[PDB]
C-alpha cells in the first residue's frame, strides 16, 4: 500500500508578526513538496527529484491553494481564540492532517482529514467519510456547522478522487526513488566495559524504507535479557540507520546472533562477533 499525506501547521506569533504557516507533503514517508509562509515570495517548492517535472501551472495553482488555506487558518485561529476564551497575547497552534492510504491496486483503504488544537485532538473525519468526531465542547459547534455546510462530502470527494489519482501519477513519475529498495550494510561492534562484561552493538545503516526488524538471539531463542535498541533515524540523504545493543559475558560473544530483516533483502541477515 501507499499513502499521500499533507501536514499543515499554523502557529500564531503575537508580538513577533504574522502567524507561521507551513505545508509539507509526503508520499509514503518521503517529503516532496514544501510551503513556508514567512519565507520571501511564499511559493510551493520541490523537495524531491521526480516532482520537478511539473509545469509552472502546477506550482501556480498549488501556491494559490496554499495561500487560500493560509488565510483560512488565520481566521480559524482567531475563531478558536474566541471559542476557548483565551488570551490574545498567547501563541497557539493549529495542526491539520489530510491524505489517503490506498492499496497497491487502486482502492482507497483510509481517508484522513483531522485537526488538532495546541497538541490535543480537536476534530476528525471518520473512516466512513461522512460523520465527524468532535472531542471538545467547542469542537461540537464546528461539527454542527460543518454538517450544515456539508464539508464531509467535498472532503470525501477530494480524498476518493483527486488524492488517489495524483498518488498514482506520483508513483508512476517517481518510480525511480519511491520504489527503490536499498539493502542495509550491517556489522557488529564489540566494546569491553569497565564492569567486566562486553557490549555488543548490531548496526544496520543505509537502508530504504525505514521498515526494518533488528533483534538479537542467544542460542536461537528469543533471548531473556536487557536488550536496548534505539528508534529508526534518518541519515540526511534518504536512508536510515538502526542499532541494537546487548550486554554479554566475556567469552560467550560467539553465542549471540544479530538478525536483521529488511524488505529489500533476499534472506534475513545473521551476524556473529
Amino acid at each position: 500500500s501507499h499513502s499521500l499525506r499533507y501536514f499543515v501547521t499554523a502557529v500564531s506569533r503575537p508580538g513577533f508578526g504574522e502567524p507561521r504557516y507551513m505545508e509539507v507533503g509526503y508520499v509514503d514517508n518521503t517529503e516532496f513538496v514544501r510551503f513556508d509562509s514567512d519565507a520571501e515570495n511564499p511559493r510551493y517548492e520541490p523537495r524531491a527529484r521526480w516532482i520537478e517535472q511539473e509545469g509552472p501551472e502546477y506550482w501556480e495553482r498549488e501556491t494559490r491553494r496554499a495561500k487560500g488555506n493560509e488565510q483560512s487558518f488565520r481566521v480559524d485561529l482567531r475563531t478558536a481564540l474566541r471559542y476557548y476564551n483565551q488570551s490574545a497575547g498567547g501563541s497557539h497552534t493549529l495542526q491539520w492532517m489530510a491524505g489517503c492510504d490506498v492499496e497497491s491496486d487502486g482502492r482507497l483503504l483510509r481517508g484522513y482529514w483531522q485537526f488538532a488544537y495546541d497538541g490535543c485532538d480537536y476534530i476528525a473525519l471518520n473512516e466512513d467519510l461522512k460523520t465527524w468526531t468532535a472531542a471538545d465542547m467547542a469542537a461540537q459547534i464546528t461539527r454542527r456547522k460543518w454538517e450544515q455546510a456539508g464539508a464531509a462530502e467535498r472532503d470525501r470527494a477530494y480524498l476518493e478522487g483527486e488524492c488517489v489519482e495524483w498518488l498514482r501519477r506520483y508513483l508512476k513519475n517517481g518510480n525511480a526513488t519511491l520504489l527503490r529498495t536499498d539493502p542495509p550494510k550491517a556489522h557488529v561492534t564489540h566494546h569491553r566495559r569497565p564492569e567486566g562484561d562486553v557490549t555488543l552493538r548490531c548496526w544496520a545503516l543505509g537502508f530504504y524504507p525505514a521498515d526494518i526488524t533488528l533483534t538479537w538471539q542467544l542460542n536461537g531463542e528469543e533471548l531473556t535479557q536487557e536488550m536496548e535498541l534505539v528508534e529508526t533515524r534518518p541519515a540526511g540523504d534518504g536512508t536510515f540507520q538502526k542499532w541494537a545493543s546487548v550486554v554479554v559475558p566475556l567469552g560467550k560473544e560467539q553465542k549471540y546472533t544479530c538478525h536483521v530483516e529488511h524488505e529489500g533483502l533476499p534472506e534475513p541477515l545473521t551476524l556473529r562477533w
Partner: peptide, 10 residues
C-alpha cells in the same frame, strides 16, 4: 496536489 479548505471557518 494538496487539499483545499474552501475558506470554511472551523
Amino acid at each position: 496536489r494538496g487539499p483545499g479548505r474552501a475558506f470554511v471557518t472551523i
